[PDB]
């Protein structure tokens, strides 16, 4: 056999010097796979993403990953400049740009404005709706040519329909061959995931496929 593992955590424990934020974490992710990371507020989901990114180092165990990371943060900031510039930053690629703005449902929002994608934003994008900031932040993350996409609750401030459609068009369709970790509140997203990690108070409550989760609970109460 030929291996294509992209990310490995082996017996990982980490502290932000008291009680562990993550303890005995084990998982692997293969190239092109979607891992859904679930769990209640404060369970350690963003801290896990931080470990992959080098911001949080393990006290015990090993993290194996090599590749470019694209991160969509919670409370993601809008920088001064146009919506386009907020999405594309440095590299111009019109085909990729169009596919991303379509998949994140920004086409209509941009088509309504006078200058279209060329309307200049302030710091924070306070003149945008919360949903608009969320979709621009996701689009920025998805547009980046990366080897690992860390999508940290990108749908939180979206209505249920908009969330469903963007999960489909963006996470599932546009990003089908991309190694993705999605931190998500939804059972529907767990069903479509290649793997699921449920965290609870810093440790793994469940790791496995959706069939395996189905065979079991707490998860049924925790998800929307
Ligand atoms: N940079 C940091 N420095 C110190 N403590 C942190 C840091 N980031 C998170 N924590 C703490 O670690 C715990 C886990 O937080 P984390 O952000 O990983 O939770 P989460 O599961 O992503 O929660 P939510 O669903 O609310 O985003 C929290 O108590 C938090 O206060
Ligand atoms: Mg978080």
Curated annotation (Swiss-Prot):
Q: How is it modified after translation?
A: N-glycosylated.
| Result for mutant: residue 131 to D | In CF; decrease in the frequency of channel opening in vitro; decrease in channel activity and ATPase activity; complete loss of bicarbonate transport; no effect on trafficking to the cell membrane, protein stability, nor on the maturation of glycans
Q: Phosphoserine is carried by which residues?
A: 129
Relate the outcome reported for changing residue 24 to Y: In CBAVD; uncertain significance
Binding residues for ATP 1: 16, 39-46, 74
The entry's stated outcome for residue 45 to M is:
Impaired maturation of glycan chains indicating impaired trafficking from the endoplasmic reticulum to the cell membrane
Outcome following mutation: residue 129 to I: In CF; impaired maturation of glycan chains
- Outcome of residue 202 to D? In CBAVD; decreased channel activity; has no effect on glycan maturation
> Result of mutating residue 140 to T?
In CF; impairs maturation and trafficking to the cell membrane; decrease in channel activity
Q: Which positions are lipidated as S-palmitoyl cysteine?
A: 104
Q: In which tissues is it expressed?
A: Expressed in the respiratory airway, including bronchial epithelium, and in the female reproductive tract, including oviduct (at protein level). Detected in pancreatic intercalated ducts in the exocrine tissue, on epithelial cells in intralobular striated ducts in sublingual salivary glands, on apical membranes of crypt cells throughout the small and large intestine, and on the reabsorptive duct in eccrine sweat glands. Detected on the equatorial segment of the sperm head (at protein level). Detected in nasal and bronchial superficial epithelium.
Q: Where's it found, cell-wise?
A: Apical cell membrane; Early endosome membrane; Cell membrane; Recycling endosome membrane
Give the source's domain of life in one word. Eukaryota
Changing residue 208 to R does what?
A: In CF; impaired maturation of glycan chains
Q: Domain text from the record?
A: Binds and hydrolyzes ATP via the two cytoplasmic ABC transporter nucleotide-binding domains. The two ATP-binding domains interact with each other, forming a head-to-tail dimer. Normal ATPase activity requires interaction between the two domains. The first ABC transporter nucleotide-binding domain has no ATPase activity by itself.
How is the quaternary structure described?
Monomer; does not require oligomerization for channel activity. May form oligomers in the membrane. Interacts with SLC26A3, SLC26A6 and SHANK2. Interacts with NHERF1 and MYO6. Interacts (via C-terminus) with GOPC (via PDZ domain); this promotes CFTR internalization and thereby decreases channel activity. Interacts with SLC4A7 through NHERF1. Found in a complex with MYO5B and RAB11A. Interacts with ANO1. Interacts with SLC26A8. Interacts with AHCYL1; the interaction increases CFTR activity. Interacts with CSE1L.
Family stated for the protein in its record: Belongs to the ABC transporter superfamily. ABCC family. CFTR transporter (TC 3.A.1.202) subfamily.
Specify the protein name: Cystic fibrosis transmembrane conductance regulator
Source organism (scientific name): Homo sapiens (Human)
Gene of origin? Answer: CFTR
């Amino acid at each position: 056999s030929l291996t294509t593992t992209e990310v490995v955590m082996e017996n990982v424990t980490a502290f932000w010097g008291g009680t562990p934020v993550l303890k005995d974490i084990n998982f692997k992710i293969e190239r092109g796979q979607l891992l859904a990371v679930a769990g209640s507020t404060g369970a350690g989901k963003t801290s896990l993403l931080m470990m992959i990114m080098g911001e949080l180092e393990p006290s015990e165990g090993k993290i194996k990953h090599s590749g470019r990371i694209s991160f969509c943060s919670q409370f993601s900031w809008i920088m001064p400049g146009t919506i386009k510039e907020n999405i594309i930053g440095v590299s111009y690629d019109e085909y990729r740009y169009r596919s991303v703005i379509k998949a994140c449902q920004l086409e209509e929002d941009i088509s309504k404005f006078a200058e279209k994608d060329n309307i200049v934003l302030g710091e924070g994008g306070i003149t945008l709706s919360g949903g608009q900031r969320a979709r621009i932040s996701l689009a920025r993350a998805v547009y980046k040519d990366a080897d690992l996409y860390l999508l940290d609750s990108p749908f939180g401030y979206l209505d249920v329909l908009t969330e469903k459609e963007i999960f489909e068009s963006c996470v599932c369709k546009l990003m089908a061959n991309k190694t993705r970790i999605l931190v998500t509140s939804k059972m529907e997203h767990l069903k479509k995931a290649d793997k699921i990690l449920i965290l609870h108070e810093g440790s793994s409550y469940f790791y496995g496929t959706f069939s395996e989760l189905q065979n079991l609970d707490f998860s049924s109460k925790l998800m929307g």
